[PDB]
Amino acid sequence: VDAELLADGKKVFAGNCAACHLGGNNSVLADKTLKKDAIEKYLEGGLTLEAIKYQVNNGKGAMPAWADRLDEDDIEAVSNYVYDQAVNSKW
Numbered sequence: 001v002d003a004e005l006l007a008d009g010k011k012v013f014a015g016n017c018a019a020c021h022l023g024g025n026n027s028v029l030a031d032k033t034l035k036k037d038a039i040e041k042y043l044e045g046g047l048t049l050e051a052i053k054y055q056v057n058n059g060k061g062a063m064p065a066w067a068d069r070l071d072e073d074d075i076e077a078v079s080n081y082v083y084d085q086a087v088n089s090k091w
């Protein structure tokens with residue numbers, strides 16, 4: 001996986017997502033974390049980059065939609081960061 005893509009995604013995550021997903025968890029709805037088993041259980045589409053990106057773009061519930069707030073490169077990077085963190089158990 002491109003190291004600069006992940007680094008970019010980490011930065012986007014710190015700036016925009018860690019407020020509700022510190023540590024890969026979820027301070028708003030505790031079960032629906034960014035960890036692999038939670039994503040597999042709760043995210044529509046399961047643990048895929050497409051699924052992650054879809055929810056980052058379009059929101060869900062109290063998860064804000066970001067497609068009108070972040071550019072496509074930031075959305076791609078943060079989705080790849082979250083996927084990498086989850087699939088590789090890096091949180």
Ligand code: HEM
Nearest residue numbers: 016017020028029032033038039042043052060061062063
């Ligand atoms: C920052 C751009 C950001 C990302 C990235 C992100 C990702 C994300 C995913 C992938 C999920 C699904 C997790 C699951 O187990 O199902 C998810 C879910 C929720 N999020 Fe989020 N999220 C980002 C930002 C934020 C912010 C700033 C908040 C709080 C204001 C937030 C909240 C939540 C909530 C609530 C959920 C659960 C949605 C649901 O199914 O009800 N996210 N996020």
